[PDB]
Design an enzyme around this catalytic site. Structure first.
Site, mmCIF file in Angstrom:
data_model
loop_
_atom_site.group_PDB
_atom_site.id
_atom_site.type_symbol
_atom_site.label_atom_id
_atom_site.label_comp_id
_atom_site.label_asym_id
_atom_site.label_seq_id
_atom_site.Cartn_x
_atom_site.Cartn_y
_atom_site.Cartn_z
ATOM 1 N N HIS A 43 0.815 -1.223 0.000
ATOM 2 C CA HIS A 43 0.000 0.000 0.000
ATOM 3 C C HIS A 43 0.858 1.287 0.000
ATOM 4 O O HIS A 43 0.306 2.380 -0.155
ATOM 5 C CB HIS A 43 -1.057 0.006 1.124
ATOM 6 C CG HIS A 43 -0.546 0.221 2.516
ATOM 7 N ND1 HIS A 43 -1.423 0.389 3.577
ATOM 8 C CD2 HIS A 43 0.725 0.292 2.988
ATOM 9 C CE1 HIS A 43 -0.663 0.549 4.652
ATOM 10 N NE2 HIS A 43 0.635 0.505 4.347
ATOM 11 N N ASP B 160 -6.712 -34.974 -58.698
ATOM 12 C CA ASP B 160 -7.844 -34.044 -58.585
ATOM 13 C C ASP B 160 -8.293 -33.417 -59.912
ATOM 14 O O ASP B 160 -9.507 -33.378 -60.163
ATOM 15 C CB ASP B 160 -7.580 -32.953 -57.539
ATOM 16 C CG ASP B 160 -6.440 -31.983 -57.777
ATOM 17 O OD1 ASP B 160 -5.276 -32.435 -57.788
ATOM 18 O OD2 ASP B 160 -6.709 -30.736 -57.796
ATOM 19 N N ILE C 178 -3.804 -28.992 -57.020
ATOM 20 C CA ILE C 178 -3.030 -28.506 -58.168
ATOM 21 C C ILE C 178 -3.069 -29.546 -59.313
ATOM 22 O O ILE C 178 -3.106 -30.760 -59.065
ATOM 23 C CB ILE C 178 -1.543 -28.166 -57.726
ATOM 24 C CG1 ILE C 178 -0.774 -27.282 -58.740
ATOM 25 C CG2 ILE C 178 -0.706 -29.398 -57.311
ATOM 26 C CD1 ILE C 178 -1.110 -25.906 -58.695
ATOM 27 N N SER D 79 -8.730 -66.756 -96.221
ATOM 28 C CA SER D 79 -8.275 -65.357 -96.145
ATOM 29 C C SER D 79 -8.431 -64.635 -97.469
ATOM 30 O O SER D 79 -8.610 -63.418 -97.488
ATOM 31 C CB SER D 79 -6.829 -65.284 -95.690
ATOM 32 O OG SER D 79 -6.008 -66.139 -96.466
ATOM 33 N N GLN E 67 -9.277 -61.332 -95.223
ATOM 34 C CA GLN E 67 -8.399 -60.915 -94.128
ATOM 35 C C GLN E 67 -7.487 -59.788 -94.614
ATOM 36 O O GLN E 67 -6.495 -60.043 -95.294
ATOM 37 C CB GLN E 67 -7.586 -62.109 -93.613
ATOM 38 C CG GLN E 67 -6.846 -61.813 -92.314
ATOM 39 C CD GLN E 67 -5.964 -62.956 -91.995
ATOM 40 O OE1 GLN E 67 -6.395 -63.945 -91.407
ATOM 41 N NE2 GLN E 67 -4.735 -62.885 -92.469
ATOM 42 N N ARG F 153 1.104 -65.171 -99.092
ATOM 43 C CA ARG F 153 1.285 -66.471 -99.740
ATOM 44 C C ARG F 153 0.006 -66.959 -100.437
ATOM 45 O O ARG F 153 0.108 -67.532 -101.529
ATOM 46 C CB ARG F 153 1.761 -67.552 -98.752
ATOM 47 C CG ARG F 153 3.106 -67.310 -98.093
ATOM 48 C CD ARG F 153 3.522 -68.495 -97.226
ATOM 49 N NE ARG F 153 2.561 -68.782 -96.157
ATOM 50 C CZ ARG F 153 2.841 -68.742 -94.859
ATOM 51 N NH1 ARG F 153 4.070 -68.450 -94.445
ATOM 52 N NH2 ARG F 153 1.900 -69.011 -93.962
ATOM 53 N N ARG F 154 -1.177 -66.786 -99.802
ATOM 54 C CA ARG F 154 -2.444 -67.277 -100.368
ATOM 55 C C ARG F 154 -2.857 -66.471 -101.591
ATOM 56 O O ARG F 154 -3.353 -67.053 -102.565
ATOM 57 C CB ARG F 154 -3.568 -67.265 -99.328
ATOM 58 C CG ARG F 154 -4.526 -68.431 -99.499
ATOM 59 C CD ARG F 154 -5.944 -67.997 -99.201
ATOM 60 N NE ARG F 154 -6.933 -69.038 -99.468
ATOM 61 C CZ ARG F 154 -7.561 -69.721 -98.519
ATOM 62 N NH1 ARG F 154 -7.303 -69.481 -97.235
ATOM 63 N NH2 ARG F 154 -8.451 -70.651 -98.843
#
Ligand SMILES: [Ca+2]
Ligand SMILES: [Ca+2]
Ligand SMILES: [Mg+2]
Ligand SMILES: [Mg+2]
Lengths: 1055, 989
Positions: free
Chosen positions: A171, A489, A524, A920, A970, A977-978
């Protein structure tokens, strides 16, 4: 010694108590720690010393004269003997509690020096030379006469507890009026908005503190209505205010929500201990508003944002609500040490990747390493349910980390000749840590085209499910093969194949009983910000389309991430529906090497530079919470270094080391009779019946049309024990009303599939075969992707996808380009998928004419695919049978007819199915069966498809023996060949022409015109072309134009 | 005498008459209910006329017979036979029903007293039992077509008002959130279960009964918490959410938008005026007459019948009228083929003479719409589209955005009105199944793509050819994808054209208020097969047995207007007279049938890169780039990236709009563009080329630089830019691929719009596609833009295809493109590593004293001192490989080898090429040199065409390339390097 006086003040502790509960509730759930009343009272005194510097002074005799001394600082003394917290006046709340706990963690540890006891200016005690005042703090008490009053009388009457503060002052230097105002100012502070605003800020609490307001005078029933409004707001939109972002980029997020604000609902701190009726599972229950609010916060506004009130099925909403709002037990320390061991492995692998190799910055999982413990929880939870396999599809980001730490592949296998490794598939086995189960883990191959694999994964999981007799085409409804699909995101929001794939989720023909989606949302997309990437709040909002629950989770909280992963697996197992987990995180590095991401996103990257990794933050959280000891944490750093060591050591060692397709009459007749072996009481549509009857006739009498020839090939494969999956738009009936694979009962709507009867042998035993025919959704990209994936998942299945018109398959260009045409060369991934593409110039316009033969012929390279355009129903039959039975996994592209389905000349004999093979190259029947002279021929017309019939008719009309028509059935690989064997039979040919309906820049001419004179120069040097003019569209828009152009071709061919 | 509670009777009569006033019309009396109960055989009715044969009558027949006797007493046409033959009669006497707020709470209802010995007292007890009977009110409702459950006679729940109030508030939320799942939106009513399936919406499973209807409950709102009667609460909820309009809105995250919808949908709507109803009906008359004509006068026109969906016409009319009410400028429509010519006639307003003079279902149109009641006018236009369903969705958006930017409205406009409106139609299966829908919806609010809201109308005929909705989508509604952008969805009954018009106007108002997309799901049906010869009952017999019992929207609406007492029989006869007139006139009308710039320009564009705003902080890595650009503009050695901004900058300065966009286009994928520079300290953006939009004297040039980072989509972005060039032919529009390898995701736009729109529809586009291309060892998805595919799509004058090897040739190519007065797309194969090649730089004189060179020679022969006569081997090439062949030629010092570049791949520069090759007279062998596999790049094309187009120069042309591959390149960098050296060695071997 010091003539002292006392000033007392009874202060309300209600706001103090309430905010301490909020603070310690938060710390417990986050980084740990406990705020005491002493922390709050001590800090308040220090602030009150700022308004009253005289309360801080002290009496002294300096030169025989009484003086009041102004110290340099506010050094708050604390009874521990009194120890001093020095320089409190320049401290923020966080610094003050750090300083407070520094002295405290030294009084207990016995590390206090004489310097810590000197220079106190003010002190606080919890029941004098060189100090002017001592502040005393009493115990929390109720005012006299309210002691012994029920905890509900206290609640009803709105009576709070009180701290009695005392001030014993010198005081000689302090006035009683000042001392009273000091205590009045501490009273004001401990009730002040801004005071608690700073405490919360300083502790990182994003929530608004409990506010000192006057008790609302309204009744309990009226307030209860507002409580219930508030419960609904948290449930519906609490996710908008959840602490889900580890970077906390948007500050504004935690305010300006009047819907979730307790204060704007006529509720105050005085209602917290008041009880309110809340409806639920056990009906109406009375709960304290405080408990209501804390459960709501924990469930909807912490590290997990829950979106579920958009789900139309109420059972599913209740299910999520119950699991998310219950008090769920904290993980065990063994479970936390396991989650941390996974983060250690994830971070060690990442550290190694960026240290040992250059150009790995684009695949960096740095900022997203929690995806590894999350994916681990998913796979473990599938193993807990006793499921068979988890098939993963993902982009490149973190892929080798997933290979090592999820698929469980060794480092020796991952880094052998270290790229393509980021695109190849893998297979592993996962063993449970705590559980006793194991599950297969596999990763599928994928291109750099983001999200393109989404339907492929689905197709691949569906094929595995069907093989395991699980789900939709299985005896059980477990769907024991789980799709785990990762996404970024920006790609998840912007790529349409996502909505197309999500749309397959619950379809009979495409369902896989729910997909677990993990979105690695690093906020981002290369250089692009989410505002430029999507027009919605979340990147996952597209999932709302199928009413899928969405969980937004904080990537810095690996406990919440694992918890959510397991919940997702449980929902999927309960409702057989897709679940999306939005894992919010960040990308610590640039997008690629050299990139400085602060060029375009300086703000985000200033924040990211202040972020410590998930592993160090999780270890610190565990310590601060008291879940692990410092020794247990040192072992965790020891584990991380060990993991980092063995990855360097293992890769170091490795661097030191490193055909008859014909069937019998019985088979044809059996498939024909099946079309009339109708279930008892079945009502066939009157327009469908003649078709079933014609099919029985054809099987016995010949003149087999294209549509039946197709069902004869598929039927005989089913009968031989093969799984046959056929699907496309309106494929059950056929676009041109020709298939009738499924026939609908006119009176009951019941479905009948005639070819399914072939799955059972004549003796009654199953053959092992199956006919799975479906009408697809209106998509090309997801459907083509799904079928590609299906053949990969089941190599023994005959898989066919049909275009409505070959003109719409361009909507599946990514799948064709990236998977079908190139998967074998790029990844070693084989597929036996068949694409049926209706093609032909018929005068229906540019979008109902071409399957773009020229484009497929351009994609083709030796042994990638087979490309065919059959002109007869039997050659188509042998082509499909050859495809299904050759033991080769190579895609087949077929250019199928439209009007040629009903051409009476384009029919086949029974002997063509029973005594022949795929040809073919085809000659005119007059030279192979009839009495035609090949030596009379001077002009040879080479063609393919339906135009043969018009050239043949024209040759027959004009009766031209000097002209021969040879078909290339085909197209790729060229039958060199064919074709040479055939042309050698026409020795007097003086001119050869390639004849086609398509524009000069389309069809087979761009290819054949260049390759035929190169491959066989002795036969084709001088090969000329007869076609439509080159066009920027597949055909003219006018039917009249088409007709004139078509006649021009025939006239030129015979001119 | 007997006192009977008539509370259930009163309550159900209110529900009955509330339903009837809104739908078919009519009013049920207490006498109808009491008379029918007695019957449960001729009933006398008091002056006492009999209703004969009541025992074989259903409720509907009994009311009809009852009112047939009323129309004989009132009209004075009763015969003696009507009084003779009676069984029982009613007048049986009937007594009247006797604080208004104090009575509601006690649970006391009104009592009605009945009169006439034991069997008489038992008959009054059997009557009593029927008026509080479920099955009785169940059958009355089914007879009146009421789809809702009647008010039940249940015992009053003993719980307090506060406890019930809570359950009421739960129920209000239930209707608001999930009431659409119970709305009468299906004109066919195929799913019976629909009105029973939900305990969530059921009042009875909420501890509430009929005894609470007059009880007041506290409900919160806009004007605060107010007390309302439960019956008022429930009837508003039903009218708003469970009648002919299903409202989905509680999924919208913006509260102000939810309140907006809630307020408009829950307020008591005023019924339309008879003039407004006669107008809606006149539109249905026009729609049905046009459809009847189309199927009568033409065959093959069943493929696009609107039969069963004709309400889309009055709906679309309400949309366009509401846009005109807001004083907007134009409505641009995109739609599939279904109902297109009907839209041309009745919406675009094109005359029948123009429509009928097929391709017509794919071509665009322009008209003007004049308001009926209002005083405004609005432009209406329809855009061209292929058969590829939904593919036009982004094209429409791009086209509306170009028109908005021209009108200075919206995002790049001074006003925020978005005075150009996209109106996009769809079918239910395509809307759910096609990904371009989600991709387009995703553009809705983006800075670079927003058009301030699109109105979506889904013509939901509940079928997709032969496919049922369960096989077409994994969600409740075909519109559920719209929830992705939080768009409000309105499901409306196509058989109620009043609800359809009301919803259309509400949609336009929402779009104008929130600048956000609105989706209207119009539920209807497909009366015929999908096309011709199609018997849809082969695959959907149930749906089609139901559809065969449906009377059309027009007959249905005329009958409801009559029933409700909105129109007289004469007013209806006039409506049939109008339909007949409309049908007549449609039959009658059709029966009658230099790129160089100055140094000043270069320098200005360079100086602009340093004319930074006051206090702008450039990123330290960006600053050297700005500085190098000023240096280049004055000193030369201009790189590719700057040469591009020099071309665009000079166009802006000459008054041109320049729109540039793609993935990470503002900075550039290879950090080279820097079109937009971000402030290091504040995040503020600066666009250097925008400075060129203002002349040195301060006046605007008229030009603009609109540069954007796209969303992660190829299909919607390419579609949007294609559409943009169509909407604004004077704009320079560029779309950039991240890598040319990803443009295959936009194949439908390339195939259907870009490469063929001119030939097919007469629709011109000047769009530029920038495709980063090149063999650098980065794999099959970072190498090729598929040159071979573009070269295959090409036909004389469809597109321009170029692969420039120098920054100035690229500059002149862009300038030529923007300034030629021709609207033709340009495809450019742009560099990656060649951006930073120090040899691939240009001189100032190349920009100021030159033009685009389609064919380039080695500088040593055109500027230097090189001998073309020394050359014996000619290497023809294109792009970056030139620099490697040039380096190799310089190293080995080979005068006998010449390298000629084809800068413009298509159209082939036949004259420039011949002129050039004629300058090398001693060439003994010519080779086409390319990095790409043999089956890719330009060889498949050039190998066939060059020896055809110029046989005297190219017969014998050989190839030097990579081997043919099933992928654009090898996956290994090491392989690439070996293959690349193989090419150079062969070329110089
Ligand atoms: Ca095969
Ligand atoms: Ca132009
Ligand atoms: Mg991302
Ligand atoms: Mg439809």
């Amino acid at each position: 010694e010091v003539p002292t006086a006392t000033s007392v003040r009874a202060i309300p502790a209600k706001l103090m108590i309430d905010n301490r509960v909020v603070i310690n509730n938060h710390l417990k759930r986050t980084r740990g720690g406990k705020i005491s009343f002493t922390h709050l009272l001590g800090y308040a005194i220090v602030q009150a010393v700022k308004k009253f510097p005289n309360m801080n002074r002290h009496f002294a005799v300096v030169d025989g004269k009484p003086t009041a001394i102004t110290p340099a600082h506010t050094n708050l003394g604390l009874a521990i003997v009194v120890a001093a917290i020095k320089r409190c006046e320049t401290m923020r709340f966080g610094q003050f509690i750090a300083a407070y706990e520094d002295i405290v963690r030294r009084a207990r540890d016995g590390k206090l020096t004489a310097e810590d006891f000197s220079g106190v200016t003010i002190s606080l005690t919890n029941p004098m030379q060189g100090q002017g005042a001592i502040i005393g703090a009493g115990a929390m008490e109720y005012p006299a006469e309210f002691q012994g009053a029920s905890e509900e009388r206290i609640a009803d009457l709105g009576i709070g507890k009180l701290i009695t503060l005392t001030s014993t002052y010198d005081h000689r230097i302090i006035q009683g009026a000042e001392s009273g105002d000091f205590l009045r100012t501490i009273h004001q502070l401990l009730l002040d908005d801004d005071f608690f605003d700073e405490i919360f800020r300083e502790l990182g609490i994003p929530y608004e503190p409990v506010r000192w307001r006057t008790d609302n005078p309204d009744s309990i029933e009226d307030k209860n209505a507002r409580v219930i409004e508030l419960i609904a707001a948290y449930r519906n939109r609490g996710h908008l205010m959840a602490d889900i972002d580890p970077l906390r980029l948007d500050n504004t997020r935690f305010r300006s929500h009047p819907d979730l604000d307790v204060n704007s609902h006529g509720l105050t701190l005085w209602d917290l201990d008041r009880e309110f009726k809340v409806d639920g599972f056990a009906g109406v229950q009375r709960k304290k508003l405080r408990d209501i609010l804390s459960v709501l916060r924990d469930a909807y506004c912490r590290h997990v944002g829950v979106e579920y009130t958009h789900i139309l099925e109420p059972e599913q909403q209740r299910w999520i609500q119950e699991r998310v709002e219950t008090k769920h037990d904290k993980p065990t320390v063994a479970e936390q040490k396991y989650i941390l061991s996974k983060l250690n492995a994830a971070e060690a692998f990442e550290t190694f990747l960026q240290t040992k190799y250059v150009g790995q910055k684009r695949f960096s999982l740095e900022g997203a390493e929690t995806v590894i413990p999350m994916m681990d929880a998913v796979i473990d939870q599938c193993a807990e349910h006793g499921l068979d396999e988890v098939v993963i599809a993902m982009p490149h980001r973190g892929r080798l980390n997933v290979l090592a730490n999820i698929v469980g592949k060794p480092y020796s296998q991952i880094f052998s000749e270290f790229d393509v490794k980021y695109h190849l598939g893998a297979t592993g086995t996962y063993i449970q840590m705590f559980g006793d189960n194991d599950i297969e883990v596999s990763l599928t191959a994928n291109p750099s085209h983001l999200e393109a694999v989404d339907p492929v994964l689905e197709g691949l999981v569906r094929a595995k499910q069907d093989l395991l007799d699980t789900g939709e085409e299985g005896s059980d409804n477990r769907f024991s093969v789980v799709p785990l699909m990762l996404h970024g995101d920006a790609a998840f929001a912007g790529q349409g194949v996502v909505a197309e794939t999500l749309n397959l989720a619950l379809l009979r023909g495409y369902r896989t009983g729910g997909t677990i989606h993990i979105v690695v949302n690093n906020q981002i997309g290369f250089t692009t910000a989410p505002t430029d990437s999507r027009s919605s709040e979340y990147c996952t909002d597209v999932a709302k389309m199928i009413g899928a629950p969405i969980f937004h989770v904080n990537g810095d909280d690996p406990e919440a991430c694992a918890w959510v992963a397991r919940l997702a697996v449980d929902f999927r197992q309960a409702f057989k529906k897709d679940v999306v987990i939005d894992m919010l995180c960040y990308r610590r590095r640039g997008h690629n090497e050299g990139d400085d991401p602060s060029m375009t996103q300086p703000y985000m990257y200033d924040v990211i530079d202040t972020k410590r990794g998930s592993r160090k933050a999780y270890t610190e959280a565990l310590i601060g919470r008291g879940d692990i000891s410092m020794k247990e944490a040192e072992d965790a750093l020891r584990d991380y270094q060990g993991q980092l060591e063995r990855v360097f050591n293992e890769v170091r060692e490795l661097e030191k080391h490193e055909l008859a397709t014909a069937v019998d009459k019985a088979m044809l007749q059996r498939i024909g009779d099946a079309h009339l072996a109708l279930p008892e009481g079945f009502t066939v549509h009157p327009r469908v019946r003649p078709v079933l009857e014609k099919r029985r006739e054809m099987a016995y009498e010949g003149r087999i049309d294209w549509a039946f020839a197709e069902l004869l090939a598929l039927g005989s494969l089913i009968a031989e024990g093969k799984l046959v999956r056929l699907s496309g738009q309106d494929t059950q009936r056929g676009t041109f009303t020709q298939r009738h694979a499924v026939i609908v009962d006119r009176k009951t709507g019941e479905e009948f599939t005639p070819l399914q009867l072939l799955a059972t042998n004549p003796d009654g035993t199953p053959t092992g075969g199956k006919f799975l025919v479906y009408n697809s959704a209106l998509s090309e990209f997801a459907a083509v992707g799904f079928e590609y994936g299906y053949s990969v998942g089941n190599p023994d299945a005959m898989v066919l996808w049909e275009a409505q018109f070959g003109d719409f398959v361009n909507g599946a260009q990514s799948i064709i380009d990236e998977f079908i045409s190139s998967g074998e060369a790029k990844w070693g991934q084989l597929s036996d998928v068949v694409l049926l593409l209706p093609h032909g110039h018929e005068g229906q316009g540019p979008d109902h004419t071409s399957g773009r033969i020229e484009r497929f012929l351009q994609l083709w390279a030796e042994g990638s695919m087979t490309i065919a355009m059959p002109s007869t129903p039997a050659n188509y039959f042998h082509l499909l049978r050859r495809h299904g039975k050759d033991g080769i996994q190579r895609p087949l592209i077929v250019f199928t007819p439209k009007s040629m389905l009903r051409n009476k000349a384009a029919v086949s004999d029974i002997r063509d199915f029973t005594e022949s093979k795929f040809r073919s190259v085809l000659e005119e029947p007059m030279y192979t069966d009839g009495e035609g002279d090949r030596n009379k021929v001077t002009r040879l017309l080479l063609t393919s498809g339906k135009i043969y019939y018009e050239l043949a008719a024209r040759k027959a009309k004009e009766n031209r023996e000097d002209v021969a028509i040879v078909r290339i059935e085909q197209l790729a690989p060229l039958p060199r060949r064919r074709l040479a064997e055939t042309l050698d039979r026409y020795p007097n040919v003086k001119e050869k022409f390639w004849v086609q309906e398509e524009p000069a820049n389309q069809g087979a001419w761009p290819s054949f015109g260049l390759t035929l004179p190169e491959i066989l120069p002795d036969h084709f040097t001088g090969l000329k072309r007869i076609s439509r003019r080159a066009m920027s569209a597949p055909s003219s828009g006018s039917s009249k134009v088409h007709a004139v152009e078509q006649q021009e071709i025939l006239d030129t061919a015979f001119g």
